[PDB]
Amino acid sequence: QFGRDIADTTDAVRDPQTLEILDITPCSFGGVSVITPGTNTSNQVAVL
Amino acid sequence: NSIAIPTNFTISVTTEILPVSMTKTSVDCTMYICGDSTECSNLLLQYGS
Amino acid sequence: NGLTVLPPLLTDEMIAQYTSALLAGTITSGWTFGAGAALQIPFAMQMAY
Ligand SMILES: *[C@@H]1O[C@H](CO)[C@@H](O)[C@H](O)[C@H]1NC(C)=O
Numbered sequence: 001q002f003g004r005d006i007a008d009t010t011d012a013v014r015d016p017q018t019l020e021i022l023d024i025t026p027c028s029f030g031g032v033s034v035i036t037p038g039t040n041t042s043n044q045v046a047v048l
Numbered sequence: 049n050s051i052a053i054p055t056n057f058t059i060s061v062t063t064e065i066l067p068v069s070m071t072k073t074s075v076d077c078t079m080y081i082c083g084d085s086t087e088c089s090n091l092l093l094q095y096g097s
Numbered sequence: 098n099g100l101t102v103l104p105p106l107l108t109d110e111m112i113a114q115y116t117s118a119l120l121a122g123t124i125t126s127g128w129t130f131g132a133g134a135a136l137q138i139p140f141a142m143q144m145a146y
């Protein structure tokens with residue numbers, strides 16, 4: 001029925017009605033950064 | 049009164065390996081401690097910096 | 098799980114452009130390229146120095 005991952009967090013499930021299999025992909029997608037000259041020097045900034 | 053003088057040489061190449069750096073890691077504390085759970089983010093917020 | 102590995106500032110193709118400029122100065126200049134303007138000198142005539 002249930003697929004648990006290496007960290008013992010569920011990721012693949014069996015539908016309780018269609019008896020099919022679904023895969024779960026958590027989505028937060030992190031890692032932003034703010035390239036900036038000195039705020040004194042200017043305001044223009046670039047995201048990464 | 050007895051000395052020993054070399055008469056023929058030998059040029060040898062050695063090797064030496066030195067670490068210089070290591071992989072630059074970075075962990076997202078909130079995303080790891082309790083990720084994708086807004087019901088835990090508030091609880092962790094008060095836990096300190 | 099938020100565990101990221103960033104890439105180094107110096108790529109593995111820029112390192113090879115230093116350690117091939119640290120190796121064409123020793124061959125053709127000797128101990129001088131690291132102490133001012135590099136001065137050429139025949140290779141044999143530097144091994145003898
Ligand atoms: C469960 O019920 C739904 C709606 O009645 C139906 O479409 C589905 O085929 C049913 N599944 C099973 C395994 O009975």
Ligand SMILES: *[C@@H]1O[C@H](CO)[C@@H](O)[C@H](O)[C@H]1NC(C)=O
Binds near residue numbers: 038040
């Ligand atoms: C701030 O910027 C102004 C003009 O850009 C400059 O005259 C001043 O020295 C700067 N001061 C600091 C602390 O960066």
